[PDB]
Amino acid sequence: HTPFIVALDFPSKQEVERFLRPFAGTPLFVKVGMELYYQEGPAIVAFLKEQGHAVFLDLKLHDIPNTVKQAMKGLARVGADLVNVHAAGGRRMMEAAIEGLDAGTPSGRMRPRCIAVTQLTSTDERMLHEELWISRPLVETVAHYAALAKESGLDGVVCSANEAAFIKERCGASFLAVTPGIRFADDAARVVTPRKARALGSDYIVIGRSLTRAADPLRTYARLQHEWN
Amino acid sequence: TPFIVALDFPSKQEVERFLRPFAGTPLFVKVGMELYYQEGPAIVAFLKEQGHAVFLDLKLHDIPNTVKQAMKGLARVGADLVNVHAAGGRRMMEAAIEGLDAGTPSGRMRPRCIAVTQLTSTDERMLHEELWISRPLVETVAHYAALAKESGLDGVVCSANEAAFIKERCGASFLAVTPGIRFADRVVTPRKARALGSDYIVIGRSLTRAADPLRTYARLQHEWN
Numbered sequence: 038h039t040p041f042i043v044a045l046d047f048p049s050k051q052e053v054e055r056f057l058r059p060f061a062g063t064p065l066f067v068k069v070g071m072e073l074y075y076q077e078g079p080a081i082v083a084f085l086k087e088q089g090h091a092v093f094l095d096l097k098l099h100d101i102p103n104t105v106k107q108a109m110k111g112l113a114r115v116g117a118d119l120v121n122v123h124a125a126g127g128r129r130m131m132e133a134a135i136e137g138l139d140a141g142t143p144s145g146r147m148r149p150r151c152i153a154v155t156q157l158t159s160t161d162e163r164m165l166h167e168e169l170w171i172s173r174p175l176v177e178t179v180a181h182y183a184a185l186a187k188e189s190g191l192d193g194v195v196c197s198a199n200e201a202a203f204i205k206e207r208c209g210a211s212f213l214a215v216t217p218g219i220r221f222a223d224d225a226a227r228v229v230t231p232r233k234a235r236a237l238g239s240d241y242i243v244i245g246r247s248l249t250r251a252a253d254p255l256r257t258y259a260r261l262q263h264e265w266n
Numbered sequence: 267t268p269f270i271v272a273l274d275f276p277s278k279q280e281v282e283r284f285l286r287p288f289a290g291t292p293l294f295v296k297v298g299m300e301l302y303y304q305e306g307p308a309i310v311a312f313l314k315e316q317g318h319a320v321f322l323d324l325k326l327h328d329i330p331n332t333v334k335q336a337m338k339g340l341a342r343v344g345a346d347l348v349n350v351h352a353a354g355g356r357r358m359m360e361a362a363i364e365g366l367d368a369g370t371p372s373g374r375m376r377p378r379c380i381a382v383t384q385l386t387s388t389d390e391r392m393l394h395e396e397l398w399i400s401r402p403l404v405e406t407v408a409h410y411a412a413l414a415k416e417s418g419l420d421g422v423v424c425s426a427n428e429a430a431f432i433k434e435r436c437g438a439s440f441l442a443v444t445p446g447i448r449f450a451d452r453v454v455t456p457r458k459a460r461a462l463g464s465d466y467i468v469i470g471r472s473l474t475r476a477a478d479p480l481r482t483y484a485r486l487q488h489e490w491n
């Protein structure tokens with residue numbers, strides 16, 4: 038429906054309501070991270086859906102297969118539209134994740150989309166080699182992980198706009214590229230512009246403070262659309 | 267108590283039913299993803315109100331700052347123990363510690379925090395062929411445990427077999443929380459687990475699904491000597 042995903046990086050419903058007030062009537066595609074979901078629970082999701090928003094539950098499930106499977110059934114029942122997991126959890130876990138989603142989804146209905154985190158954006162090549170003990174290049178490791186997720190039946194991954202192109206060449210154009218780290222050309226304090234993100238292949242872009250901290254949220258949301266188009 | 271009871275139930279209703287017999291017995295219980303994602307922080311407050319210690323097993327694995335704000339949140343919900351994936355890196359694990367601190371009142375210690383080195387369901391094939399980790403599983407587990415040790419965490423989740431080896435690497439006081447526990451009738455035996463060096467043993471269906479939970483808990487204590 039929309040390429041923009043708004044990250045609700047707040048610790049409570051109250052702050053969430055404050056941000057969304059001006060967006061009344063303009064259904065959004067919002068991302069609920071750990072901070073928010075662990076302090077508000079499934080209640081926050083029912084709330085966002087009542088308002089007519091699409092919800093991306095960014096909890097990055099990474100546990101044993103069965104546990105993930107059971108957790109996904111619940112996440113599908115709560116009403117999530119998109120969820121993710123760590124490819125590092127293995128192919129078996131990722132397949133289980135899909136099994137849980139279908140299990141928690143009514144017949145004749147589409148299960149929530151499920152994408153995989155390959156390597157976190159905060160993970161540099163050094164950390165990859167010295168801490169994680171993965172001797173292979175960061176770029177190829179990402180490509181490998183994406184392929185694994187693709188092999189598991191997942192719909193895509195979380196990647197930088199700069200990784201979208203090669204990930205799609207290896208996994209196919211339909212393989213979703215959900216990319217965070219978005220900033221307008223004139224802000225911030227590892228980043229790309231909405232237009233540039235689109236040119237690179239991103240299907241969805243996660244926007245946070247560039248919108249949640251704007252003086253004029255509505256005009257800024259419009260700017261997002263204009264640049265992207 | 268060295269026993270941690272895995273509350274692997276669908277909702278609060280099943281949890282209440284199971285705990286009733288234990289009214290006169292403080293327990294150290296584990297709340298995983300399935301239950302927590304279904305009940306929310308409310309399940310924690312409840313358990314605490316019943317005089318139980320709580321291990322919120324969510325295995326957080328995300329960027330540093332997100333894990334920090336998340337832990338600030340888990341400390342305020344009342345959790346006594348939490349965990350993270352060592353795969354997240356030293357910075358992330360250190361941030362978890364910061365989060366717990368900023369989330370703790372002052373009249374008490376920050377909730378403790380342990381790291382998952384490699385999931386108990388990860389074998390060497392998965393590790394090498396899928397995760398691309400070019401080193402033995404056993405050596406990789408010690409490495410990850412060391413990363414957690416160096417990050418300032420209190421311990422790790424590991425099999426009772428890796429317990430001794432991990433402590434030799436990170437210190438005898440470095441905690442060893444061990445899952446996969448089963449009665450004679452993975453390879454477990456509560457007593458065997460204790461002989462291997464486990465500090466806490468996570469017991470699951472072997473107890474929660476037993477015909478007589480309370481009595482199975484008494485047997486757990488006995489085999490533990």
Ligand SMILES: Nc1ccn([C@@H]2O[C@H](COP(=O)(O)O)[C@@H](O)[C@H]2O)c(=O)n1
Binds near residue numbers: 044046070159246247
């Ligand atoms: N260093 C960072 C900071 C934020 N992010 C992601 O993008 C979102 C926040 O973006 P700004 O608001 O982009 O901070 C978060 O919800 C997070 O998942 C990331 O991937 N790497």
Ligand SMILES: Nc1ccn([C@@H]2O[C@H](COP(=O)(O)O)[C@@H](O)[C@H]2O)c(=O)n1
Binds near residue numbers: 469
């Ligand atoms: N293969 C397995 C089976 C159980 N477990 C852990 O122990 C608990 C279940 O214990 P039984 O039901 O003790 O297996 C779960 O909460 C889980 O975290 C594990 O880590 N790997």
